[PDB]
Amino acid sequence: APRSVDWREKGYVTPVKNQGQCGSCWAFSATGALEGQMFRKTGRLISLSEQNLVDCSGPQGNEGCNGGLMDYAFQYVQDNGGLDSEESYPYEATEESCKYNPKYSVANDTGFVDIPKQEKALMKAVATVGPISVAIDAGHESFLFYKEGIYFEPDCSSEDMDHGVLVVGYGFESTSDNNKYWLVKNSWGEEWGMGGYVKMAKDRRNHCGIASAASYPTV
Ligand SMILES: *C(=N)C1(NC(=O)[C@@H]2C[C@@H](S(=O)(=O)c3ccccc3Cl)CN2C(=O)C2(c3ccc(I)cc3)CC2)CC1
Incomplete structure (x- = not known):
């Protein structure tokens, strides 16, 4: 794999969105993947x-x-x-009746791939596939108030994930000792x-379970 990957640079990633006060993280992880x-x-970002x-x-x-799975x-x-x-079906942040209209369908999938539960497997997927849906343990106040740098939480669980996000790449800081990271939207x-x-x-014993439930759709 390359030493660094950033799919934002290659046009694969839409701007950051805001789920609001709805437990819809899984949906944003899924749309991102x-x-x-x-x-x-297709060459079109929609x-x-x-x-x-x-x-x-x-x-x-x-x-x-109230939650879900990618x-x-x-x-x-x-x-x-x-x-x-x-555009056709805007975000409301409340669950409502299904208003799917096939006339405005712009995406499809033919299934999905669950990645093996190792950071090395996750790296190979990110390098070759594109952005990957992942589960993380986001249930510490350190995450809520995260601002900058590499997030490390000694009490993070590799088993107890509660938040769906999107890995868009990986790399390393040049500053000092443990400097590798996953780039997460x-x-x-x-x-x-x-x-x-x-x-x-990254490469710190599957920190926060980032490699524990990673997947992507096939198209
Ligand atoms: C997002 N706003 C909230 N979190 C969830 O809906 C998360 C997303 C996934 S996950 O990424 O945490 C995960 C965890 C374990 C295995 C696979 C995955 Cl993808 C599920 N979420 C959960 O919080 C749980 C869940 C599982 C299944 C269902 I249906 C609903 C909820 C509790 C694991 C709502 C905060």
């Missing part, structure tokens, strides 16, 4: 509808603003035959972290 894979396929996923993916197992989102897109654009607005991103500790 599918935005990447559609861009790879922002996708989280609201469509929040409102419509109950049959696949998702719980709207893999269930990818299954919904496959079962449904499409996913609307953000959050869905908490641009105000949080580093423009809405968190450079998370």
Whole structure:
């Protein structure tokens, strides 16, 4: 794998969004992964509808603003035959009746791939596939108030993940001792972290479970 990857540079990543006071992180993780894979396929970056996923993916197992799984989102897109654009089906931050309209479908998927539960496997995926949906343990105040640098939380769990985000690359700081990170896009607005991103500790015993439930859609 390259020593550093940043898919933002290659046009795969939309601007940071804000989930608000709805438990829809999983939807933003899923749209981010599918935005990447559609861009790879078509050369067009089109922002996708989280609201469509929040409102419509109950049959696949998702719980709207009460949580969900990226893999269930990818299954919904496959079962449904499409996913609307953000423009056509804007984000409300509340669960509402399903208003999917196939006329405005701009994405598809044919399934998904679960990555092996090792950081080395995650690195190989990020290097070759594009942005990857991941689960992290985000349940420490250190994460809520994260501002800059490499996030390391001694009490982070590699098993107890509660937040779905998007790995858009990886690299290393030149400053001193433990300087490698995953470049992670959050869905908490641009105000949080580093423009809405968190450079998370990489190759430090699967810190915060970042490699424990990683996946991406096939297109
Ligand atoms: C996002 N605003 C919130 N978190 C969730 O919905 C997270 C997302 C995923 S995950 O990324 O944490 C995860 C965890 C374990 C295995 C795979 C994945 Cl993708 C699930 N979320 C959860 O909080 C839990 C969950 C699991 C399944 C369902 I349906 C609903 C919720 C509790 C694991 C809402 C805060």
